[PDB]
Design a protein around this ligand. Structure first.
Ligand SMILES: Cc1cccc2c1[C@@H](CCC(=O)O)CCC2
Length: 269
């Protein structure tokens, strides 16, 4: 069970979630349970409709800019699964046992879509229900998720499970290992022993400057702390490395379109 962190958000008619410079700290997937939603991806400048069988995948270490809008009147529950790095790395012996195909894939897609059948959605639902009803062996989930990811990578002809030595993974592991450190460019270069010229590409490829990058990682770090049931916003701001509650709230509102305490309540309730 520890391999997954899950949440279910309610969404009334024609209301919209809006995410800007949302940093994806760990592999995430989401789907709606009924009705129709509109997804506008500002990174790919595309909009499209999703239904109860559309699974949307967000790649680890991407910077997401999209909105999700309900086009139903009946309320909609959005389920989100965050997959722990421990579990992702246990899959490697399944995805990369098929590596000669995988070298020919590209690395441009951060938000992937899968139209699946009922069984796939029954499995992910039970994941979202904390396996209260059906329990699943570690081998079943490893086979299921590795097979799921390789189907989606095949569809887009692009790698989804990145590898450890990717520059942006090194930057982001480093920042997350010491969230309250006063990070500057010079620290990244010195820890990774890598020229600014080369590391720079990972931030411009994602449309961020250094400050918005650090801020996005800290917002996700703070969202992770809110999910643990820690409830004090003032503590969460300082624990996530911000210098004031005001600055944390301003960045949070800019990223999530909701105030930190509004989000903290969407979790515990
Ligand atoms: C709050 C929400 C509602 C609907 C969809 C999505 C979200 C957040 C999930 C928050 C997280 O896990 O950090 C971002 C990904 C997709």
């Amino acid at each position: 069970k520890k391999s997954f962190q899950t949440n279910v958000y309610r969404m009334s008619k024609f209301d919209t979630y809006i995410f800007n410079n949302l940093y994806i700290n760990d592999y995430k997937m989401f789907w709606i349970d009924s009705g129709i939603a509109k997804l506008i991806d500002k990174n790919c400048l595309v909009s499209y409709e999703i239904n109860s069988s559309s699974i949307i995948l967000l790649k680890k270490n991407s910077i997401q800019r999209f909105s999700l809008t309900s086009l139903s009147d009946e309320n909609i529950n959005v389920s989100v699964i965050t997959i722990s790095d421990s579990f992702i790395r246990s899959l490697k012996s399944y995805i990369l046992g098929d590596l000669m195909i995988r070298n020919l894939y590209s690395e441009n897609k951060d938000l992937l879509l899968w139209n699946c059948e009922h069984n796939d959605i029954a499995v992910l639902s039970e994941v979202v229900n904390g396996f209260r009803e059906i329990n699943y062996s570690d081998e079943f989930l490893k086979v299921f998720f590795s097979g799921f990811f390789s189907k989606v990578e095949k569809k887009y002809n692009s790698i989804f499970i990145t590898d450890d030595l990717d520059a942006m993974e090194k930057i982001s592991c480093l920042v997350k290992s010491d969230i309250t450190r006063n990070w500057r460019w010079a620290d990244i270069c010195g820890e990774l022993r890598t020229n600014r010229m080369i590391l720079k590409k990972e931030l411009e490829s994602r449309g961020v400057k250094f400050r918005e990058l650090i801020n996005s990682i800290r917002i996700s770090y703070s969202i992770s702390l809110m999910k643990t049931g820690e409830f004090k916003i003032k503590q969460i701001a300082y624990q996530s490395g911000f210098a004031s509650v005001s600055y944390f709230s301003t960045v949070f509102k800019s990223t999530m379109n909701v105030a930190p305490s509004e989000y903290l309540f969407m979790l515990t309730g």
